Amino acid sequence: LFGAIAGFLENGWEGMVDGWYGFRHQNAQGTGQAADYKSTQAAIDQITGKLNRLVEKTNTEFESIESEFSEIEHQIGNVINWTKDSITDIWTYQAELLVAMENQHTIDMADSEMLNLYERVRKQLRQNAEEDGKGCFEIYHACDDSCMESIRNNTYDHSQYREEALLNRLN
Amino acid sequence: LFGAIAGFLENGWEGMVDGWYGFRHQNAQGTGQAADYKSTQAAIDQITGKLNRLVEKTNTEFESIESEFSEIEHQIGNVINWTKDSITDIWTYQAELLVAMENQHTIDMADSEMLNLYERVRKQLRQNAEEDGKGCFEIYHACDDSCMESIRNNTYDHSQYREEALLNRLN
Amino acid sequence: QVQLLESGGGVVQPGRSLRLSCAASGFTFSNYGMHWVRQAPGKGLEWVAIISFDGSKKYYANSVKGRSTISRDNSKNTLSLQMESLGPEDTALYYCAKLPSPYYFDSRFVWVAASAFHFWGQGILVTVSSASTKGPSVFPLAPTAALGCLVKDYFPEPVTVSWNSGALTSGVHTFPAVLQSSGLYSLSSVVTVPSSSLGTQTYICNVNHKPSNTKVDKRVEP
Amino acid sequence: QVQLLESGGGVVQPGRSLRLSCAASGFTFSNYGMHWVRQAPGKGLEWVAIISFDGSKKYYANSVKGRSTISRDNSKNTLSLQMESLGPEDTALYYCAKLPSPYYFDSRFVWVAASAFHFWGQGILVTVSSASTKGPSVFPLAPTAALGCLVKDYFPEPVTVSWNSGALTSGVHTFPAVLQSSGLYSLSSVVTVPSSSLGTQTYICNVNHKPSNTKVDKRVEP
Amino acid sequence: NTDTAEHLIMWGIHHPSSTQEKNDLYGTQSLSISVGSSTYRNNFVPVVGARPQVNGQSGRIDFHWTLVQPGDNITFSHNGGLIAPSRVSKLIGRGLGIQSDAPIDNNC
Amino acid sequence: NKISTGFTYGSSINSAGTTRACMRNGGNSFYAELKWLVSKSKGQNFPQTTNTYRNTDTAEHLIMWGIHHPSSTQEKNDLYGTQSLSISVGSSTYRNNFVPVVGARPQVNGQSGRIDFHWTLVQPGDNITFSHNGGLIAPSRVSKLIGRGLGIQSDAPIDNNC
Amino acid sequence: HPIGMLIGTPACDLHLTGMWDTLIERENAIAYCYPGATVNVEALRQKIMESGGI
Ligand SMILES: *[C@@H]1O[C@H](CO)[C@@H](O)[C@H](O)[C@H]1NC(C)=O
Ligand SMILES: *[C@@H]1O[C@H](CO)[C@@H](O)[C@H](O)[C@H]1NC(C)=O
């Protein structure tokens, strides 16, 4: 478990239907919302690949060994019942294990992709801002809507505001 | 595998019976020890939920297909022996797999919770201290026992010592 | 396994102090942190106090904070509670029990377990008033059909009722108590039977009242 | 399920505007982002336009950027495309279809699914030229052995050919069209049969040409 | 069978140990046993043979059994040597069969 | 392991029956662990015979025998006479009866008559009795299976170097 | 022995009829006072041990 979905992000954004991992900003212009394409597409592709590998099954042909309209010998019938009930229990246990493990892995994979996008945005905002902890980024100088898109487009340059941030933090 | 339990923390604290993840501090007052409630309770709850989902089993009723005090027909007896030994081998392999995977997951989950608590404490000590690497935090100004509890209570404010730390690091 | 002993019950007048003490066995008491809870008559649950396995912190409830005192001894495996200035808001059933609590209130030995040691045993039923511990008055309610026994005009009310020393339990109905204008309670208890054995069987009802040492037995007849 | 309707085909002269419109059913159209693609005659695929499920952004292709316009309406479940200045580089088959696209061009309801709703339906076959919509001329190619029908000198070429109202489909060969020095196309279609039924069966070939309302039927004989 | 559930009937086929015993028990006639129902038909013929003594006796008895469904009739046509069923059995309900040697503990 | 049964028969029984279907030493022979019991005179009835085998080993033994079925009435009358043939096998854990049946059958290995082989496991300390009237294939030696082995049914050759 | 309950052997006189949710068989279970055998004895034994009354 990573500290993103069940950790420092103590609240989800139900109003963010644009994607699974998006940005919400508040600048002098006002409040705005967008979504990151890369992480959302990665999660969607992984989940769809899981589902695709899951739903495919050739299911080798089987035939009837027990008669439905006549009586079977008692001993061989008991043997068949025992075998089929054992197979049922085995498949039930494997189904439980597969479902539980796959759900855990899907949730933790969404969490990992969230944290990876977080680290990407941090590597972009390397030396011009600070992270308050609750998923937000306390920008120390400013950021325009075009600056926000540059953060989305992964084109934000920190050497352009480095000296500005240093002078604002010192004075 | 995260770099906390098997990584940069090269030694465990056998004397720390207060919890799984606790704090040890040395200030001008002396040496003190405490424990974090959140991570320990999270780990305990996850392990107990694992055990609860593990120990429950309805175990559909089965009956005897082989006689114990009389001789069974040789061919059907061989078939029953083959089937039961195959079922035994299948359950043995599944038991091995389940045990190994669950132990690996439990150890790595404890490691992940340790690293998440580490990141929480770092987000608390954002700009007033540095991490030496060996799980310790080289506080650059000071921290009282009340400051230590505030770090435990997740109430430490860094804007109160930010300028102090900056002036101590510059001069 | 689940076997206990409780003491401290009775009739305490308002203003004095109550002292309750419960001791359990069948397990290692020196590790489980214990809790004292109270339930007012009728319904409603209100927690009273918690104690660590070693007695490090109490953290009393605000309703009785600074007024009660919980303590424990692991050598004799005992848990005691003492409270003063017993107003009418303290007449309730006090349960000592082991509940799912923070981990450090328990020991490191039972952390790695899904057992979830469960408890809550029995009650105490503390009552505060002008004591006037009265003895019960029993009357036989005599005539499918039914018959019963009515116990009235006594105090307090830790009363129990059985049919033929506690044998007949089918079709029986033990009704709750009713308080009246003389500070006294009443209680009816009936049992049904087909209408073919009026003068045939030996129907006997037994009533036990503890804080008067009263044992009454009565018979029903047409 | 997979049932559609398309409109806007015909013969449009160069310089005017083409308007195509496709409407599908059997599913919720208001969520799937749709695409318009074109394929020049022969081979070669070139994408034309994409549209969001609500029409937020178009992002036209540079080959037709600023010259075409794609639009959609979710109430009537329709997708339209309008283009002007139709040069010879626009004569192609235009397919409206649902392709695997970015997720926000689709809705949140079909993200969690491995269905991958597939489409591409039929074609349109837009052609631009000096219209001169001509009627087809049919000639019976008459003598194992074979026999066929040859359709020549008409325009445009959304032509179809069947044998006995579309019954005989074995051993048939429908050959591609051939354009000649008069702006007209030709097409042969043959069928094989053993050499024992010359004057025995009723061999009939049917030719349908849509942008002339032409239905021709011919018979083969020695 | 007049019950609403199936019944379980058992019978026996005797096999003497000597010709003298056969002639004394069933005479010198040709022995034949025939069992017939709507879902079962079989024939058994007693056979004389010398066999070692088990429980002091040499002759044997082969036991047969079958399930009679509700509303069915079963007929025995015998000439001598049939072990007739005085009472037939009916199995009721389900039960767990245990084959073990450990003693019973009625307190756990 | 093969253990002799020790069965003895009177001078009226020719226990050395042979046929051209089982060649062992260039002459007519029979199965090695069995013996064919016929009448010494070519037209007389086979005498009512009783034989008893008693297992004296600490392990179970495996006994096989055969029931003959002639191909014609003439062969039956020549081998066992015109009497009614009856064979009875009896032990403490096994009891059975066999009657030879005459029937016309196609030739296999040049012979039309058949032999049905039966087998059973005799437990230590048990006695098994054969009461026969003619047509019984007696076991000259019985078998004892020793130990466990892996049975393989294959066609690939053996490589004694891997 | 379970067969003695159906046939009525002396050693099963205590168990000719009854009701139960668990039937317990022993190793010394005697089924025949007069020597003999039973056809398809395993199926019948399974039917009896699976039953809960006779
Ligand atoms: C481990 O703890 C369990 C209870 O959680 C206890 O039953 C067991 O005896 C302990 N074993 C060791 C080796 O400490
Ligand atoms: C969930 O979405 C699927 C399609 O992805 C849809 O079929 C289903 O009805 C939806 N269920 C709910 C409860 O929204």
TrEMBL record, chains A, B:
Residues bearing carbohydrate = N81
**Keywords for this entry?**
Hemagglutinin, Viral envelope protein, Viral penetration into host cytoplasm, Virion, Virus endocytosis by host, Virus entry into host cell
Intrachain S-S bonds:
C143-C147
Pfam families linked:
Hemagglutinin (PF00509)
Q: Name one GO molecular function term.
A: host cell surface receptor binding
**Gene3D superfamilies on file:** 3.90.20.10
What job does the chain carry out?
Binds to sialic acid-containing receptors on the cell surface, bringing about the attachment of the virus particle to the cell. This attachment induces virion internalization of about two third of the virus particles through clathrin-dependent endocytosis and about one third through a clathrin- and caveolin-independent pathway. Plays a major role in the determination of host range restriction and virulence. Class I viral fusion protein.
- What subunit structure does UniProt give? Homotrimer of disulfide-linked HA1-HA2.
- This protein is called what? Hemagglutinin HA2 chain
- The species is Influenza A virus
UniProtKB/TrEMBL annotation, chain F:
**Chain positions carrying an annotated carbohydrate:** N127
Top-level taxon: Viruses
Which residue positions does the secretion signal occupy? none
Q: Where in the cell is it found?
A: Host apical cell membrane
Reported function: Binds to sialic acid-containing receptors on the cell surface, bringing about the attachment of the virus particle to the cell. This attachment induces virion internalization of about two third of the virus particles through clathrin-dependent endocytosis and about one third through a clathrin- and caveolin-independent pathway. Plays a major role in the determination of host range restriction and virulence. Class I viral fusion protein.
Q: Can you tell me which family this protein belongs to?
A: Belongs to the influenza viruses hemagglutinin family.
Question: What quaternary arrangement does the UniProt entry report?
Answer: Homotrimer of disulfide-linked HA1-HA2.
* Protein name stated in the entry: Hemagglutinin
UniProtKB/TrEMBL annotation, chain G:
Function noted in UniProt: Binds to sialic acid-containing receptors on the cell surface, bringing about the attachment of the virus particle to the cell. This attachment induces virion internalization of about two third of the virus particles through clathrin-dependent endocytosis and about one third through a clathrin- and caveolin-independent pathway. Plays a major role in the determination of host range restriction and virulence. Class I viral fusion protein.
Instruction: Please identify the protein, giving its name as recorded.
Output: Hemagglutinin
Question: Where in or outside the cell is it found?
Answer: Host apical cell membrane
The entry's family comment says: Belongs to the influenza viruses hemagglutinin family.
Quaternary structure?
Answer: Homotrimer of disulfide-linked HA1-HA2.
In terms of the parent sequence, the fragment covers: 59 to 112 of 327
